[PDB]
Amino acid sequence: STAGKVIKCKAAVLWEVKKPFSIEDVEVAPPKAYEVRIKMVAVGICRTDDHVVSGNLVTPLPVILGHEAAGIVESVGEGVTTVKPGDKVIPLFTPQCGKCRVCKNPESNYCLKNDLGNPRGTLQDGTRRFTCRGKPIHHFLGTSTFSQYTVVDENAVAKIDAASPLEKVCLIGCGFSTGYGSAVNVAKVTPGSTCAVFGLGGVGLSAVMGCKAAGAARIIAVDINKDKFAKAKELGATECINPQDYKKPIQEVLKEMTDGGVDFSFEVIGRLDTMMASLLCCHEACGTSVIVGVPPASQNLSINPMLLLTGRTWKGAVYGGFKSKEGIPKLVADFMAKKFSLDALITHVLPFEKINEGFDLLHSGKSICTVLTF
Amino acid sequence: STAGKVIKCKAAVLWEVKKPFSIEDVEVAPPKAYEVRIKMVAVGICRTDDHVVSGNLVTPLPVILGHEAAGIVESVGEGVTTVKPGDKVIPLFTPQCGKCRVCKNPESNYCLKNDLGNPRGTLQDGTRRFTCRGKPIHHFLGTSTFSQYTVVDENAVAKIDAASPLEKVCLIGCGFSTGYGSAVNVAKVTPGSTCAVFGLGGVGLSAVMGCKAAGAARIIAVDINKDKFAKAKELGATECINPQDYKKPIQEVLKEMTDGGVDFSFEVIGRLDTMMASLLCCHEACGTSVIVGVPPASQNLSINPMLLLTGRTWKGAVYGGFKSKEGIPKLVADFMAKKFSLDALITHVLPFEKINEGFDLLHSGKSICTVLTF
Ligand SMILES: [N]C(=O)C1=[C][N+]([C]2O[C]([C]OP(=O)([O-])OP([O])(=O)O[C][C]3O[C](N4[C]=NC5=C4N=[C]N=C5[N])[C]([O])[C]3[O])[C]([O])[C]2[O])=[C][C]=C1N1=[C]C(I)=[C][N]1
Ligand SMILES: NC(=O)c1ccc[n+]([C@@H]2O[C@H](COP(=O)([O-])OP(=O)(O)OC[C@H]3O[C@@H](n4cnc5c(N)ncnc54)[C@H](O)[C@@H]3O)[C@@H](O)[C@H]2O)c1
Ligand SMILES: [Cl-]
Ligand SMILES: [Zn+2]
Ligand SMILES: [Zn+2]
Ligand SMILES: [Zn+2]
Ligand SMILES: [Zn+2]
């Protein structure tokens, strides 16, 4: 079959920034001890993959991007015990090693084995498993899912329900868990509260769902693209506003609309201005502002400390606060039990080969979550 | 009786910024409905009072400062149901109107009837009560305690135990509650956690106490004034560090000795550089940084939101997060229950008239909490 042997498959390689994805033939090496080789079934296009392409997120190039996915274990390396071939799995962009200070803390999830802080672009052992034209290709967030087959560390993969529809549940790999957890875990939206969500893509809309689920009484959705309004309202938004319709700065508008400011603001775009407006629109005395969007590299915000002194809370989080390996499978169970649906988010489905077309949809703002099938 | 009549007394008025306080004769008009005229018995010198003197905190001048205090109800206005003459009381720089959005929210205390956000220098009805040489003198934070008599709104005054040593219990009026509550109420320091406290003035030392009461395992006290360490140690600090002894940045020094960073850091000074170090020294994935120090006017920080995205929580609070009308007396009760001691804080006791000498000791750093008696 393929276990123990090198696999030669297709992968979308980014050789340089601001350049189209090149579909190459790569050699995927067999998994070492404590690694799992996965056969991809469905991958979602997260903006963070785009952040690398536009040059806003730095990470070693050439590289195989992708981190929102679902697939089947092709083989496991010696030592692997949490999963076996044929198992349906979801690769996790933030591992859960279970040994570190962070992992052993019940309230934090940014595991110390991540590759976000200082991007080595390798697996946890400091080595790569891809080769294209003889040249070694870097991994992204230790998942590199834009490939027919990838190898990830064991603590970076979760075994999910065998009955899970992979083309739906892959969104739980990032988009959904990130947005839903931001509301539910990170901010911890109280019942009867008012929330404002800035940005309405797959992640932001999921944040709307999580606010709805938290029992928020009012959910104001903000986006400059009005086409997103139908979905937003459908998912729980009590009202949607377009900053371009006003002469006043977005935060004053919200302050006036909510008797002084929302209780929870969510920045789910990744811009300095929306991050500021987001902190500004929540009530000075009892507002919590949560940053979900990923900021452009080495950009700084100028903030007057007095904004926080009155009683505001500013915080950010990766993966919606979910301890990865432990939390994702549970969200899949919730999906199976029909606790929430992912159908409104998936607007486009294309074959992996059309990956570039997928990104064009994101750029045009015509798509929410686009899924690539292998 | 003096009730109904205008009281003529001595008060430390400030006419110009950065000039000595003038002990003059002012006229304290009688309390209007819902107001209380209090006879000051002991006022403490809080660093914020100094901020107005130095120009760091802007407020209308002329003004009678002072807010950390205790006294006896001289007389009450019409409709006053919470206090009666003779009742030992404590004025609150932040009131608890009890009927506003912030007051109805259990997790917040910045009552909308405060005079910090936008200083008017008046009592809640928009008018002044003091006069000096034919001119009206402004109030400060609605309290104005550097006067033998003062008039405060009912919701900005709390009655305490009719046996409380007002010469000590006055620290609960600001300094102690602010620091203590910041650890207990705002950070919500967890048992076995590791904390860092930048600034060992009366408020920092109080935070140390609160960090120990919460059951922190390590309390690293940071200060350039070496003479504070003995007190810090005495109050619970596991170790004291002086930034000047190092050739390396204090934040780095602190991360290196706490395996990545502390769990809860507190900035209890009011400088931007210290507020930055304080944010930087708490673990990037599970650290909560709390701002206690009132920063200088108009100055603001430059931060990379990536500092928050990984898991950090940044918040600030006034009055240690305590809802003034309810928390202050409760605190006194605990003091009355001998649960804590303010003796280690009060380092100098001066007669009201020696007020300028008080601020001199504060500027020299050879004092923690100086009390002025009447
Ligand atoms: N934290 C975490 O974890 C995360 C994050 N993230 C981020 O977030 C963001 C967003 O996402 P998305 O959803 O995917 O995207 P999109 O689709 O693109 O959306 C966007 C939106 O928004 C809007 N806008 C823009 N601009 C504007 C707006 N609104 C308003 N205003 C303005 N100006 C548009 O229209 C649309 O709708 C980003 O940043 C991302 O990145 C994600 C995820 C998660 N992670 C982490 C990771 I290292 C990976 N991932
Ligand atoms: N948030 C509030 O409710 C609230 C309440 C009371 C006071 N405050 C503010 O908290 C701050 C301090 O209060 P305080 O009464 O304890 O003041 P304080 O001046 O007596 O204490 C300042 C301490 O900081 C130390 N310090 C100064 N620069 C330092 C540095 N660069 N590095 C390390 N240590 C340094 C000084 O040696 C001193 O020990 C002030 O801004 C005060 O206005 C805020
Ligand atoms: Cl007047
Ligand atoms: Zn993502
Ligand atoms: Zn870990
Ligand atoms: Zn109020
Ligand atoms: Zn004070």
Q: Is B23 exposed, middle or buried (0-12, 13-18, 19+ CB in 10 A)?
A: middle
Residue A206 makes CB contacts below 8 A (sequence gap 6+) with A175, A176, A177, A178, A179, A180, A345
DSSP summary character for residue A26:
E
B276 interfaces chain A, CB cutoff of 8 Å: no
Q: Are residues A135 and A184 in the same domain?
A: no
Instruction: Output the six-digit token pair for A25.
Output: 């033939």
Q: Angle at which helices B355-364 and B47-54 pack, to 10 degrees?
A: 100
Specify the 3-state DSSP secondary structure of B13: strand
Residue A47 makes CB contacts below 8 A (sequence gap 6+) with A201, A203, A270, A294, A362
Instruction: Output the six-digit token pair for B316.
Output: 């600030």
Do B255 and B273 form a contact (C-beta atoms < 8 A)?
Answer: no
Query: Nearest CA to CA, how far is A202 from chain B (Å)?
Result: 18
- CB-nearest to B303 from A108, A286, A301 is A301
Pairing of the two strands B130-132 and B135-137:
antiparallel
Q: How far is CA A269 from the centre of its chain?
A: 12
A310 interfaces chain B, CB cutoff of 8 Å: yes
Using CA atoms of B76, B8, B329, B218 in order, give the dihedral in degrees to the nearest 10: 160
The rounded Å distance from CA B123 to ligand 3 centre is 10
Q: Are residues A30 and A171 in the same domain?
A: yes
Instruction: Output the six-digit token pair for A285.
Output: 């005395």
Residue A99 makes CB contacts below 8 A (sequence gap 6+) with none
Q: Cα separation of A134 and A148, whole Å?
A: 18
Instruction: Output the six-digit token pair for A91.
Output: 């690769």
Residue A261 makes CB contacts below 8 A (sequence gap 6+) with A254, A255, A281, A282, A283, A284, A287
Q: Which residues of B touch A109 (CB under 8 A)?
A: 285, 311
Residue A40 makes CB contacts below 8 A (sequence gap 6+) with A69, A70, A71, A145, A147, A148, A149, A150, A352, A374
Q: Are residues A150 and A259 in the same domain?
A: no
Q: Are residues A147 and A218 in the same domain?
A: no
The length of chain A, given as a count of residues: 374
- Give per-residue burial for A153-168: e unless 16+ CB within 10 Å, then b: bbbbbbbbeeebebbb
Q: Which residues of A touch B275 (CB under 8 A)?
A: 305
Amino acid (one-letter) located at B330:
K
User: From the CB of A109, is ligand 1 less than 6 Å away?
Assistant: no
User: From the CB of A31, is ligand 1 less than 6 Å away?
Assistant: no
Q: Cα separation of A124 and A36, whole Å?
A: 12
Strand residue runs (E) in chain A: 7-14, 22-28, 35-44, 63-64, 68-76, 88-91, 130-132, 135-139, 149-153, 157-159, 194-198, 218-222, 239-241, 264-267, 288-291, 301-303, 313-316, 346-351, 369-373
Instruction: Find residue A89's DSSP bridge partners.
Output: A71, A159
Q: Are residues B61 and B112 in the same domain?
A: yes
Element (H or E) spanning B159, and its range?
strand B157-159
Q: Which residues of A touch B291 (CB under 8 A)?
A: 305, 308-309
Q: Cα separation of B204 and B200, whole Å?
A: 4
PDB experimental method: X-ray
Q: Are residues A192 and A173 in the same domain?
A: no
With an 8 Å Cβ cutoff, are B311 and A305 in contact?
A: no
Q: Are residues B266 and B334 in the same domain?
A: no
B81 interfaces chain A, CB cutoff of 8 Å: no
Q: Are residues A148 and A195 in the same domain?
A: no
Torsion sign across C-alpha atoms B316, B321, B325, B328: negative
The rounded Å distance from CA B82 to ligand 6 centre is 16
Tell which residue, B67, B360, B306, has the closest CA to residue A299: B306
Do B10 and B25 form a contact (C-beta atoms < 8 A)?
Answer: yes
Q: Are residues A247 and A224 in the same domain?
A: yes
Strands laid side by side in the B135-137 sheet: B63-64, B7-14, B22-28, B130-132, B135-137
Q: Are residues A244 and A323 in the same domain?
A: no
Do A14 and A21 form a contact (C-beta atoms < 8 A)?
Answer: yes
Torsion sign across C-alpha atoms B248, B250, B252, B254: positive
Place of tokens 């920045």: A267
PDB resolution in Å: 2.4
Q: Are residues A267 and A372 in the same domain?
A: no
Element (H or E) spanning A254, and its range?
helix A250-257
Specify the 3-state DSSP secondary structure of A91: strand
Do B300 and B275 form a contact (C-beta atoms < 8 A)?
Answer: no
Amino acid (one-letter) located at B29:
A
Do A44 and A173 form a contact (C-beta atoms < 8 A)?
Answer: yes
Chain A residue with the nearest C-alpha to that of B306: A295
Q: Cα separation of A336 and A165, whole Å?
A: 9
Q: Is A213 exposed, middle or buried (0-12, 13-18, 19+ CB in 10 A)?
A: middle
User: From the CB of A228, is ligand 1 less than 6 Å away?
Assistant: yes
Give the number of other CB atoms < 10 A from CB of residue A125: 12
Place of tokens 């930048």: B198
Specify the 3-state DSSP secondary structure of A273: helix
Do B44 and B370 form a contact (C-beta atoms < 8 A)?
Answer: yes
Ligand nearest to the CA of A286: 6
Instruction: Output the six-digit token pair for B97.
Output: 């109107």
CATH number for the domain spanning B197: value is: 3.40.50.720
Instruction: Output the six-digit token pair for B192.
Output: 């076995």
Q: Cα separation of B107 and A177, whole Å?
A: 27
Q: Which residues of B touch A262 (CB under 8 A)?
A: none
- Residue-range definition of the domain harbouring residue A246: 179-317
CA distances from A139 to A4, A41, A74, A128, B281 (A): 20, 19, 18, 7, 30
Residue A75 makes CB contacts below 8 A (sequence gap 6+) with A2, A3, A4, A30, A31, A36, A37, A85
Q: Cα separation of B329 and B13, whole Å?
A: 29
Q: Of A300, A317, A334, which residue constitutes the final position of a domain?
A: A317
B317 interfaces chain A, CB cutoff of 8 Å: yes
A295 interfaces chain B, CB cutoff of 8 Å: yes
CATH number for the domain spanning B106: value is: 3.90.180.10
Whole-number CA gyration radius for chain B: 20
Give me the number of domains chain A comprises.
2
Q: Which residues of B touch A301 (CB under 8 A)?
A: 302-305
Residue A167 makes CB contacts below 8 A (sequence gap 6+) with A41, A42, A70, A349, A371, A373
Q: Are residues A68 and A26 in the same domain?
A: yes
Residue B107 makes CB contacts below 8 A (sequence gap 6+) with A286
CA geometry: angle A55, A56, A60, nearest 5 deg: 60
Q: Of A301, A317, A333, which residue constitutes the final position of a domain?
A: A317
Tell which one of A294, A318, A347 to mutate to probe ligand 1, the residue whose CB is within 8 A of the most ligand atoms.
A294
- CB-nearest to B306 from A101, A284, A295 is A295
Q: Of A317, A334, A349, which residue constitutes the final position of a domain?
A: A317
Instruction: Output the six-digit token pair for B215.
Output: 């059951």
Q: How far is CA B179 from the centre of its chain?
A: 8
